[PDB]
């Protein structure tokens, strides 16, 4: 119903009459149209999306790694702008937004020749010199080690890593081996249509207390075959004949008459069950995931992600107390829209039904010849009894009453008062989002604070999504991937500590926050005596240089 | 939960029956078996029983080819397994459980068997759900819930060779059984937007308690569960729907 | 000349490449005709 | 939007011409400038807005 | 609609391409391919040449529609206003022009 | 006529002789810091970001193609510096580079 | 184009030079930008083919 | 007029068996309760949004 | 609140100005450390504390 | 301005071939700078714009 009010469909549509208008101006769409672009912009103001801040002093390196990797993932593996636009538009239009967070992985084996090396003890000083140069290059620059060291020295260094003794290697021959090459290893976030997902109704207004959640999606057999081990029992489901997509409950934008001839690329609707179940029967609830297509159960296992919660994030637009869902603006504005539309239609009917351009001429004022002369466009003579200045009538538009304009103005004022959105005002709330940026001593009119509150509600959802992705990255990504992305030493996070988010904090990064942080760093540099400690000053300068987007200068000041 | 489960099962059965009978009613191409001209002329007695033959299936294939109806499947070239046959059949036909023996007994132009079973070409092909064989250019599918007009043929007398009959107002009449071939992109099931989509079961229930208390029943000890849905079909190309009417053995 | 088109809308394999499974022209054209009705409806709005 | 026309101002043919939307001629005894009425919204009193 | 160069080499004809994923080996893996055909003849068939491995098209929407690829311009919002404004101006011109001056 | 014009300007957000200076403050360091824009300018800024993302994608694809197709001597001729080699495994995943409009 | 890590300055410099040279020489930038924006605004969707 | 001076306070909440079994020692006599049925339909005092 | 942190920082700075920087080393180190903590820079604060 | 730039580029390319050395030396009064024939096709090492 709320969407129908927005788009002018269903009950919102004006009735159709043969001789009268059906013009309905769009109020709710307008009020939402300013709100969208007001809200989207803060998330697109900078090149980096996520800001990770260490909680304690050991956490600087971990925060730097996680910020680097998370920013790289969001910048490369996703279309950030489209995701942000859909997220904001859905939150505004439906009153709530469900985000599904998952992981994507596809592994293909290959055969390549790997040379076989025979070890030999380190002889003389030259072998040790070359080995030490290799180790030093590995410490200073991992990419240089990968690209320029060569294979035999790499094998010697690996054996030195395994055992203290150093050796020198000479190749003998090449033997074929099988290697796993990951084509795709990246998290995926995708917004969900509300009609798809069903949540436990007995959660009493909190997503955490929910027992189960069921989501229905479209999938093709290639997706199921990407990871063979996870799914069992795929032969019973037909993949050859049935080619409508017609499952009623599932709601989708796919055209109805469209299916691929190829059996493997055919799409079938599947269901998932994320929830808690008593697997051992002794009263301990544990998370599980299940999947079934039609009437066949293909997948059954525990929750794979380290977090241990359902992979869904729920955000309300305008909250209702003690309830999951939210409310949009259309609920308040339906009646104002209806009355404004009625007024405008009446105005247009008044103008349209009238006669315009018609000329009425009295009988007997002009005889035949003078009538023809008048109609042709030349001079004439009229009977003196009747005065053609007053008697010849040329019709016009009727004059509009003041009631229509007054009522339209009243409706617009009431809509603006309730919602708090005006035509050409506001929108600068995104600049003052950051605490240090302008949240300190920030003065904004009454209307800006409602927009700021909605902005905070969206930023919380972004923080939760980032936290989930960080938790998944801690386990799923390997060491060499992180080293390649960051070019720094890998830091390991113990598996026990994943459940409770320790030592790191996630929030959105904007342009002004970095500027104010630079200002405060310069202030601290002035306040402290620059000659007190060289290392402290170098660390401050490197930190300032990092915010101003100069990696080379920052690294140069760090390793000075 | 038992009552609710039975309610939902009944709803699904009713929906299936309604859709299938609408499809049977709206069928552009109808080919009466035997030498009949309408439902009344269908008979199993006399010189010519109204029972399908190879020529009827060949003519139906020819008509569907002329109407440019797209094919559904692909031919099968057999494997290297002994006693395996190749089948050229590209369309799908739905028959009831009453007609299958007659289809089994049928012979082709040269007197040979015309019903190739599924065990012969189970290898090197795919067997659809409910498939029981393939004849000529048609693969046969058996629908357990298939309907049939009853007491629609001609009058039944003592010369009855054995075909099924039904009683109508004190006199017996022969039954009529269909075989339906739905062509691609022929019909669509219509439905409203707000509240009711095409086939959505809207279930409401009010357990006894405060909410069902009213002036008629001040205390409140009642209840109800209800289930409803919308339906309607639009036929885009009726020339593609095919039907054959015939009697069936007992 | 050289008889007519040797395959039914190049069904089966034309054998351009060495792949075990080859697409053939019929499958590609079939996907095109499947997709076309929606695109035709969409272009009316742009027009 | 309703239009009310006096009786006797226009005969049959002139009335049909006026309805169709072209030129006409009226009886001089009746004045179409004032007699033909086109109803509009009534004017709101100031008391409602004041309250 | 009436234009054809006389040189056979320089005549221009319509051709189709298919950039998509296919199971080339039948083992269940989807790999990118490209195919080109003219009329009823397949003239080119091979894997995706570009390094990225994705379809070489970049799509940009003007006003996004939630959970849909295409976008919408401003004409949706402005058609009715344009019609009424045109009607008013035509009315004023008729009023002036039809009169005698 | 005045009412229709006002409604059109309100829905679309374009006035006759107003706006246009949005592109001058696009840059992050340039004016994104402490850049105050009226309500009309941010819609145009959003559309400009949507176009800039498409330009970034095109630039990245063209970089990917240049990494393979162009030979060494062509690049050395154009830039007059030593050549830098990108391994083939690193092509699929975009590392070490970021593209934006200047 | 800007470097993500500190060793990437040389690669970023080469890529910027080569890409800018290609766009200024092998293309008519003004016509392309005009077509790009006009298509996006008029149709609501703009599809660019890269080859 | 002061919450601190109150002698008693009573609160009613919804719970499941697994929550009580989280701390086996704290609670006793769980067996007597009829977990089957015993729905919130029985109490018309508790106010909740549950269906 | 956000502004409370700023005002505490300013008060600490004023006290550091009034007191001689060379009067006592430990006092000024601690003043700088809790100035740093309010500015959300933990490593620096710990670094001046244990200096 | 783009059209004027294209005109300038064309005229530079034509000058590189048709003009002799002594004419260029007379006009500029500086040592002659030679451009090889292969590099004419791709306009490297120069940029033309309105001043």
Swiss-Prot record, chain B:
Main location: virion
A GO term from the CC aspect: viral capsid
Cell location: Virion
Keywords (A to Z) from UniProt: Capsid protein, Virion
Source taxon at top rank: Viruses
Entry keyword Transport: no
Role of this protein: Assembles, to form an icosahedral capsid with a T=9 symmetry, about 60 nm in diameter, and consisting of 535 capsid proteins.
UniProt protein name: Major capsid protein
Native organism taxonomy: Viruses, Duplodnaviria, Heunggongvirae, Uroviricota, Caudoviricetes
Gene name of this polypeptide: 56
Portion of the full sequence shown: 152 to 401 of 401
UniProtKB/Swiss-Prot annotation, chain E:
Subcellular location: Virion
Subunit text: Homododecamer.
Role: Forms the portal vertex of the capsid. This portal plays critical roles in head assembly, genome packaging, neck/tail attachment, and genome ejection. The portal protein multimerizes as a single ring-shaped homododecamer arranged around a central channel.
The protein's name in its UniProt record: Probable portal protein
Organism for this UniProt entry: Enterobacteria phage N4 (Bacteriophage N4)
Lineage: Viruses, Duplodnaviria, Heunggongvirae, Uroviricota, Caudoviricetes
Curated annotation (Swiss-Prot), chain F:
Organism for this UniProt entry: Enterobacteria phage N4 (Bacteriophage N4)
Disulfide links within the chain: none
Compartments it resides in: Virion
Described purpose of this protein according to its UniProt entry: Forms the portal vertex of the capsid. This portal plays critical roles in head assembly, genome packaging, neck/tail attachment, and genome ejection. The portal protein multimerizes as a single ring-shaped homododecamer arranged around a central channel.
Subunit structure: Homododecamer.
Protein name in UniProt: Probable portal protein
From Swiss-Prot, chain G:
Domain of life: Viruses
Encoding gene, per UniProt annotation: 59
Compartments where located: Virion
Residues of the full protein shown: 103 to 153 of 763
Name recorded for this polypeptide: Probable portal protein
Coiled-coil regions, chain positions: none
Source organism (scientific name): Enterobacteria phage N4
The protein's assembly and partners: Homododecamer.
Signal peptide: none
Function comment: Forms the portal vertex of the capsid. This portal plays critical roles in head assembly, genome packaging, neck/tail attachment, and genome ejection. The portal protein multimerizes as a single ring-shaped homododecamer arranged around a central channel.
